[PDB]
Amino acid sequence: RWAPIPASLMENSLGPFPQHVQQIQSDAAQNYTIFYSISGPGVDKEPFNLFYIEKDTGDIFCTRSIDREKYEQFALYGYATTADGYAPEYPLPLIIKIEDDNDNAPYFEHRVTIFTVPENCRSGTSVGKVTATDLDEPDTLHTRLKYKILQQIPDHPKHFSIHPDTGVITTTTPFLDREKCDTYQLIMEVRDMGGQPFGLFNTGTITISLEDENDNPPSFTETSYVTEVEENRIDVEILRMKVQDQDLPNTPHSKAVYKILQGNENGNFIISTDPNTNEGVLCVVKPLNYEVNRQVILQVGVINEAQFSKAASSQTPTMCTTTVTVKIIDSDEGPECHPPVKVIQSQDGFPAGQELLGYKALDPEISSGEGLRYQKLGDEDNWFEINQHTGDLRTLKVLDRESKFVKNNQYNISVVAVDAVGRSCTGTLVVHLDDYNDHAPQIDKEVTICQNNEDFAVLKPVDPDGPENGPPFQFFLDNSASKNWNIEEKDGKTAILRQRQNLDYNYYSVPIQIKDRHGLVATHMLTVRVCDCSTPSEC
Amino acid sequence: RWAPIPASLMENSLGPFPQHVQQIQSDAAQNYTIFYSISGPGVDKEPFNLFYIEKDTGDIFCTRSIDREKYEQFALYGYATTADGYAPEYPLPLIIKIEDDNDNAPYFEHRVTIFTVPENCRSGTSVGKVTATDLDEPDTLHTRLKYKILQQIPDHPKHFSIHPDTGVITTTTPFLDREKCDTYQLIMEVRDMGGQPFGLFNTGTITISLEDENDNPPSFTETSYVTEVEENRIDVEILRMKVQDQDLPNTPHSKAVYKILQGNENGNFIISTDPNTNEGVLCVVKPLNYEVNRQVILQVGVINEAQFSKAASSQTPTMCTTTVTVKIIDSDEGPECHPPVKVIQSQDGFPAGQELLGYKALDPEISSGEGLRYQKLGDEDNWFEINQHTGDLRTLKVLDRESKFVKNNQYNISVVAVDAVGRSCTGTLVVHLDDYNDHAPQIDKEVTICQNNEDFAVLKPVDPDGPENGPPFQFFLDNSASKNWNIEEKDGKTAILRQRQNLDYNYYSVPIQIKDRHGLVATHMLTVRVCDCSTPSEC
Ligand SMILES: *[C@@H]1O[C@H](CO)[C@@H](O[C@@H]2O[C@H](CO)[C@@H](O[C@@H]3O[C@H](CO)[C@@H](O)[C@H](O)[C@@H]3O)[C@H](O)[C@H]2NC(C)=O)[C@H](O)[C@H]1NC(C)=O
Ligand SMILES: *[C@@H]1O[C@H](CO)[C@@H](O)[C@H](O)[C@H]1NC(C)=O
Ligand SMILES: *[C@H]1O[C@H](CO)[C@@H](O)[C@H](O)[C@@H]1O
Ligand SMILES: *[C@H]1O[C@H](CO)[C@@H](O)[C@H](O)[C@@H]1O
Ligand SMILES: *[C@H]1O[C@H](CO)[C@@H](O)[C@H](O)[C@@H]1O
Ligand SMILES: *[C@H]1O[C@H](CO)[C@@H](O)[C@H](O)[C@@H]1O
Ligand SMILES: *[C@H]1O[C@H](CO)[C@@H](O)[C@H](O)[C@@H]1O
Ligand SMILES: *[C@H]1O[C@H](CO)[C@@H](O)[C@H](O)[C@@H]1O
Ligand SMILES: *[C@H]1O[C@H](CO)[C@@H](O)[C@H](O)[C@@H]1O
Ligand SMILES: *[C@H]1O[C@H](CO)[C@@H](O)[C@H](O)[C@@H]1O
Ligand SMILES: *[C@H]1O[C@H](CO)[C@@H](O)[C@H](O)[C@@H]1O
Ligand SMILES: [Ca+2]
Ligand SMILES: [Ca+2]
Ligand SMILES: [Ca+2]
Ligand SMILES: [Ca+2]
Ligand SMILES: [Ca+2]
Ligand SMILES: [Ca+2]
Ligand SMILES: [Ca+2]
Ligand SMILES: [Ca+2]
Ligand SMILES: [Ca+2]
Ligand SMILES: [Ca+2]
Ligand SMILES: [Ca+2]
Ligand SMILES: [Ca+2]
Ligand SMILES: [Ca+2]
Ligand SMILES: [Ca+2]
Ligand SMILES: [Ca+2]
Ligand SMILES: [Ca+2]
Ligand SMILES: [Ca+2]
Ligand SMILES: [Ca+2]
Ligand SMILES: [Ca+2]
Ligand SMILES: [Ca+2]
Ligand SMILES: [Ca+2]
Ligand SMILES: [Ca+2]
Ligand SMILES: [Ca+2]
Ligand SMILES: [Ca+2]
């Protein structure tokens, strides 16, 4: 079957109705009469009675106006029957095609649309795309939409340009900046018919608001800073420096972050950020001493939580920094005494009535150290006497390491220094005595031996001198015990009193001399007890 | 077969070519491949390659612009065959109908055309009809013509009016006159599109020339005429009168015809029309006699060869006529003599030397008959002698009816009258004389009779007088022969000489008297001889 050739009706005909469409006719109309009849969606179906046919002339007619956008075409059947109801001709499948006119204006899905763009973006940066629906016959001039910007606000300079065919808005300058203007509005138009002035149209708004980029570093209020704090302070804020950021406030592009760049090596200072005011609070956390440093110079800088961009302040070093000089003020302190211990050395044979360098107390204000009233405290055998105005020492006794108040060969005396108000230090003074051979080997003199269980005694000398000036000892007999006693010296620190087999139960006496390593003699009278004991207790 | 549904093309398509017309498609295409092809006057016939079909898509296209006025529609055949040569479809009869736009202006067949009408016609008289060719599609606005006169010249009054739809020119007044205006021009316009101002148009001329009708009778130059001709003249023109006709000259409406209305009863005059000058020649054909009438007065009229019309001077009495007075002149004539014979009566016994009224000779100039010199000619026995002046008779001899110069009782004598110049007539005078009884019956005297074969004779008298003064006669005897002779009168002119038986052979003498009807006696002596003869000569 061949496709039917379509007759065409223009939508929105006003009249006069009934309006004429086409004329169907059959050649078999000769010889005998024929009754023309019609049927299809449009006559005996929905929509009803849109068409009808003159029973004789075969002329088709139209009873009402048609909206192409509701009905695009009608597929009908043409008939040729006769009064008797005979049917010479098969039915004619015809179609009536509804043609389109520009009876619809293109409109915008939404009155006002938003787009957003990052500031400082490249020109030709495409920002977005608009689309308008036009219900006319598609892919025809009646539907060919053309876009263009009707007006921009602020009016100049124009930063936007829309491609008329696609509807893409794009940028025209690279100089978009949120800090100069944060939002632009464009009034738009859609004209069908290819944009020719007899086209149908509507307008709409399209607001463009810029998204912020951190293209501005923060900057301090004043060009440079100065302040004051007292020495030996802690947990106190020195100053508050405020800052300016030209970007979006209360955001990582706005919030500041300070850093002490140079000057804070020891850790004396710390800086932090008041979160409610975004200023930098400078505090003292470890104390300063006026005497060591009178002036500290800090260089503090500021940065944003989030990073910098735009490539004008990014390649180049643009953290803005100011130099804050913190002055420390003087407090007149009591006296200090470091190290907590001084030490001086001397010979053990050091004479009395001598002057010796004692504890030096350094006054912090003036290094001369005068104006102080020293004072001894912990002196046992009173070896010393202090100079009240210079803290020097005067020997009273002859010094002597072998004193029963000499542990480790040292003597302890503590001194209290006092200033002209009531403040006081304390120092400890160690007296390290070097040794001299001023003693000789000493021993006990009450010897004791049993009879049938010992033929000897063991006698043990002790040189109170130092290990260098002590043993090895040398033991001599006096010949008072000529050939009734004898002594032998195996080691250099022990000796054994060998009696001879000529003994009585009595108290004999044997004089014995003993020598130190150098040759200092002592003489010792031993009273030996000769008991018939067993153990060294039964006597 | 159902009639094909036509797809439509606008003539004068600008483009863009190739342009899409319609799309042929076959249902049997889902089964196996089909290659579409078309053919008809428009593809492989004339005009060639205007159309073509995409073999697969079935779209028909058009390659060039079409002039509907060259080709009103194209009847094509669409074919759907396959590579294998199968043919699902019989060929599809298509027709591509070319639509018309108003691209032709209606024009006039001839720049200037002529029509003609007779003058003095009724208003609404149809003069002619114009037709313009417009090659556009008939029965549409593109050809719906409206006609109109743009200008008529002479400008006023407008005598013509054209019907805007049909193109028939008509008259508007009845006052058309060729003698006032012979020709009109109409400047015309034809506007298609129903004469609406955006219609196409052209102009033309239409000359109207009036046909002449005889609406003017001819009229004489002079108000009246006078002239002179000679008495007793023949075959000569008396005068030439010219005439005026304001109609079409040298035509049956101009050429004249004269007729004598009154005055020419006897037939003296005849008039005719000179064909070379159209004037009237008045002639004499029977002669005039000055003495009878000195002046004749004629009534002449003139009319046109062709009859009069318009029914204002044709229905109404308008033959113009003039009175011609023709003067007759006197001619000095010879003498005339009518009747050519006179007759006069008299007694036969009329005396000599007597005067009698004779022949009258009429001189025409003066009726006195004087100035005339008469003269006798034919008088035999000289009965008369004529008077030379006037026409009298003088008896010379005594008159006598029984004269031997008188036949039938009349006497002829001719007289010639002569005037004082030399002209002469001739006349005869018959003299019928009355009878008198002056003679008596006379007879011979020589009788003849025989004896034995005759007893009587026969004698016959003759009275020279008239039958009235003659017989019947009466015969008397003198009684000289007492009883020897006797006569009897049977008839009125008979006589028989009866002798008696007492007779002897001798020569007797018998007196016989005889009288006429009235009683005049004569005596005659007969010498009668009676011999014994036999025949009428031998004695
Ligand atoms: C006389 O005064 C001096 C003052 O220093 C005493 O000598 C000091 O002895 C102390 C205790 O032995 C030493 O203290 C240190 O202690 C830590 C742990 O507590 C240990 O790790 C160290 O090795 C050291 O022993 C101190 O260094 C030492 N000072 C000096 C200058 O020698 C001395 O003991 C005093 N005399 C008497 C009789 O107490
Ligand atoms: C219809 O009538 C015509 C008369 O000219 C005739 O030729 C034709 O055959 C008729 N129709 C049929 C189907 O025979
Ligand atoms: C520019 O950018 C917008 C959003 O990225 C697009 O919609 C447009 O087509 C062009 O790429
Ligand atoms: C675009 O402009 C028209 C002006 O004709 C407005 O009516 C419309 O609302 C939109 O602003
Ligand atoms: C688009 O929307 C704006 C409001 O944002 C209107 O002012 C404008 O006329 C258009 O309707
Ligand atoms: C300084 O320091 C000592 C302890 O080392 C105290 O005993 C003295 O009284 C002073 O306060
Ligand atoms: C009037 O009559 C003329 C003939 O005199 C026609 O030619 C014209 O068409 C109209 O009928
Ligand atoms: C009819 O009249 C017009 C005047 O507009 C002429 O131009 C034309 O030639 C025709 O004579
Ligand atoms: C008819 O003819 C005359 C000239 O004879 C033109 O003047 C007129 O315009 C029309 O062509
Ligand atoms: C009168 O006279 C003429 C001559 O003058 C004759 O010819 C005529 O016959 C008549 O006698
Ligand atoms: C009488 O007779 C004569 C001749 O005698 C004629 O000549 C004349 O005319 C008249 O008749
Ligand atoms: Ca619609
Ligand atoms: Ca549209
Ligand atoms: Ca539409
Ligand atoms: Ca920026
Ligand atoms: Ca920014
Ligand atoms: Ca910032
Ligand atoms: Ca200090
Ligand atoms: Ca200080
Ligand atoms: Ca101080
Ligand atoms: Ca010592
Ligand atoms: Ca020692
Ligand atoms: Ca020693
Ligand atoms: Ca054309
Ligand atoms: Ca046309
Ligand atoms: Ca036209
Ligand atoms: Ca006239
Ligand atoms: Ca005339
Ligand atoms: Ca005339
Ligand atoms: Ca005369
Ligand atoms: Ca005369
Ligand atoms: Ca005369
Ligand atoms: Ca006589
Ligand atoms: Ca007589
Ligand atoms: Ca007589």
From Swiss-Prot, chains A, B:
Every Cadherin domain range: 1-108, 109-220, 221-337, 338-441, 442-539
Glycosylation sites: N31, N412
BP GO terms, sorted: cell-cell adhesion; desmosome maintenance; establishment of skin barrier; hair follicle morphogenesis; homophilic cell adhesion via plasma membrane adhesion molecules; negative regulation of epithelial cell proliferation
Cellular component terms (Gene Ontology): cornified envelope; desmosome; extracellular exosome; ficolin-1-rich granule membrane; gap junction; membrane; plasma membrane
Subcellular location: Cell membrane; Cell junction, Desmosome
Keywords, in A-Z order: Calcium, Cell adhesion, Cell junction, Cell membrane, Cleavage on pair of basic residues, Glycoprotein, Membrane, Metal-binding, Phosphoprotein, Repeat, Signal, Transmembrane, Transmembrane helix
Domain notes: Calcium may be bound by the cadherin-like repeats. Three calcium ions are usually bound at the interface of each cadherin domain and rigidify the connections, imparting a strong curvature to the full-length ectodomain.
Protein name: Desmocollin-1
Source organism of this protein record: Homo sapiens
Part of the full-length chain shown: 135 to 673 of 894
